[PDB]
Design an enzyme around this catalytic site. Structure first.
Site, PDB file in Angstrom:
ATOM      1  N   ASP A  25     -13.086   0.961  -6.339  1.00 13.65           N
ATOM      2  CA  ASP A  25     -14.501   1.134  -6.729  1.00 13.65           C
ATOM      3  C   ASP A  25     -14.785   0.565  -7.939  1.00 13.65           C
ATOM      4  O   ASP A  25     -13.804  -0.055  -8.674  1.00 13.65           O
ATOM      5  CB  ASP A  25     -14.390   2.810  -6.739  1.00 13.65           C
ATOM      6  CG  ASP A  25     -15.762   3.552  -6.606  1.00 13.65           C
ATOM      7  OD1 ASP A  25     -16.702   2.665  -6.564  1.00 13.65           O
ATOM      8  OD2 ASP A  25     -16.053   4.713  -6.738  1.00 13.65           O
ATOM      9  N   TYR A  26     -16.088   0.426  -8.275  1.00 10.40           N
ATOM     10  CA  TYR A  26     -16.705  -0.193  -9.383  1.00 10.40           C
ATOM     11  C   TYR A  26     -17.091   0.711 -10.485  1.00 10.40           C
ATOM     12  O   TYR A  26     -16.282   1.089 -11.361  1.00 10.40           O
ATOM     13  CB  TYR A  26     -17.773  -1.308  -8.835  1.00 10.40           C
ATOM     14  CG  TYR A  26     -18.421  -1.848 -10.287  1.00 10.40           C
ATOM     15  CD1 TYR A  26     -17.520  -2.768 -11.060  1.00 10.40           C
ATOM     16  CD2 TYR A  26     -19.679  -1.621 -10.702  1.00 10.40           C
ATOM     17  CE1 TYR A  26     -18.338  -3.200 -12.209  1.00 10.40           C
ATOM     18  CE2 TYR A  26     -20.360  -1.987 -11.911  1.00 10.40           C
ATOM     19  CZ  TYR A  26     -19.361  -3.041 -12.718  1.00 10.40           C
ATOM     20  OH  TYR A  26     -19.894  -3.464 -13.652  1.00 10.40           O
ATOM     21  N   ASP A  27     -18.188   1.325 -10.155  1.00  8.44           N
ATOM     22  CA  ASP A  27     -18.528   2.338 -11.330  1.00  8.44           C
ATOM     23  C   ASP A  27     -17.549   3.584 -11.378  1.00  8.44           C
ATOM     24  O   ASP A  27     -17.159   3.832 -10.452  1.00  8.44           O
ATOM     25  CB  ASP A  27     -19.930   2.890 -10.688  1.00  8.44           C
ATOM     26  CG  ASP A  27     -20.923   1.899 -10.997  1.00  8.44           C
ATOM     27  OD1 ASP A  27     -21.507   1.636 -11.925  1.00  8.44           O
ATOM     28  OD2 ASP A  27     -21.651   1.355  -9.788  1.00  8.44           O
ATOM     29  N   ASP A 216     -12.538   6.798  -9.005  1.00 10.44           N
ATOM     30  CA  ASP A 216     -12.739   7.943  -9.672  1.00 10.44           C
ATOM     31  C   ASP A 216     -13.486   9.221  -8.996  1.00 10.44           C
ATOM     32  O   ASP A 216     -13.186  10.241  -9.572  1.00 10.44           O
ATOM     33  CB  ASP A 216     -13.565   7.463 -10.913  1.00 10.44           C
ATOM     34  CG  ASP A 216     -15.112   7.303 -10.345  1.00 10.44           C
ATOM     35  OD1 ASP A 216     -15.059   6.458  -9.575  1.00 10.44           O
ATOM     36  OD2 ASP A 216     -15.734   7.747 -10.993  1.00 10.44           O
TER      37      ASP A 216
END
Length: 280
Positions: A25-27, A216
């Site tokens: 995942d990025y953010d 997250d």
């Protein structure tokens, strides 16, 4: 809860593996949670870290993100080896391809016609409710309706959609706090993650011997679930949530913060032949 990712175990399996798969995942995962999405434009450090990881052809490196296609391409697209999944599974770019596939447009979205008809019907009959239409997801909102009757209407509408639309098209019906949503099954990150592992085929010796999957949030949990169903050897797979040890998760490990994620990937990068030489 989980123990913190055992970095020694991770590095050992990384070195041993001939093929590696990374799904990030990025953010909230590679970069901190922020209010202003532009403030989460990847730092130079994050970009260097990703570029170096993806440069090694033994690695298949995927960013699986809710961000717009235009955002991922603008800020990370210059790294040609990155696989990019944007807009909740609706746009995909394979490693080393310039071509984006529009997965929504590649599907039959005839279901949208029926869902609109059904939602419009319930909207006219549920004061305060309204329809939100996005590219791929349709959402019926009813918070402004009478609470009990709204909830009733939503239960009735959901049952109707499940017995009709959801049995004809590959879509699922979701219930939010005061909403109903219909969207394609391919939006689910677990669907996305399982697809990536199965792309290697049904031959054990061809499977990656190293998988690192990081995320997250609640949607990222579905990636961890999918990997638990992958059939890969347990010691080959590292599903890692970003959060506290006490966090309940489908992952087997945690890292506390995005800084720890970047530090972990840097450790893997520093095991390169070139870096090992320079280190002496």
């Amino acid at each position: 809860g989980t123990p913190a990712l055992d970095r020694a175990k991770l590095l050992k399996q990384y070195r041993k593996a001939r093929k590696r798969l990374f799904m990030f995942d990025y953010d909230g995962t590679l970069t901190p949670i922020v209010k202003d999405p532009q403030a989460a434009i990847p730092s130079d450090r994050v970009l260097r870290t990703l570029k170096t990881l993806a440069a090694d052809p033994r690695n298949a490196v995927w960013i699986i993100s809710g961000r717009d296609q235009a955002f991922l391409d603008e800020w990370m697209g210059h790294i040609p080896e990155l696989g990019l999944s944007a807009e909740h599974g609706c746009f995909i770019r394979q490693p080393r391809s310039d071509d984006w596939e529009n997965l929504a447009e590649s599907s039959d979205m005839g279901w949208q016609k029926e869902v609109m008809e059904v939602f419009q019907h319930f909207t006219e009959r549920t004061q305060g409710s309204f329809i939100e239409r996005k590219r791929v997801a349709l959402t019926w909102h009813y918070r402004r309706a009478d609470p009990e009757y709204g909830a009733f209407q939503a239960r009735e509408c959901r049952k109707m959609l499940e017995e009709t639309v959801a049995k004809r098209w590959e879509v699922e019906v979701m219930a939010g706090k005061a909403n109903l949503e219909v969207r394609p099954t391919f939006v689910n990150k677990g669907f996305i993650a399982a697809r990536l592992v199965q792309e290697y085929g049904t031959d054990p010796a061809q499977a990656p011997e190293f998988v690192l999957c990081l995320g997250d949030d609640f949607t990222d949990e579905d990636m961890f679930r999918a990997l638990k169903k992958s059939g890969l050897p347990a010691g080959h797979v590292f599903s890692v949530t970003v959060g506290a040890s006490s966090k309940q998760t489908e992952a087997s490990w945690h890292l506390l913060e995005p800084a720890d994620v970047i530090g972990t990937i840097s450790m893997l990068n520093n095991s390169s032949s070139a870096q090992e030489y320079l280190e002496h």
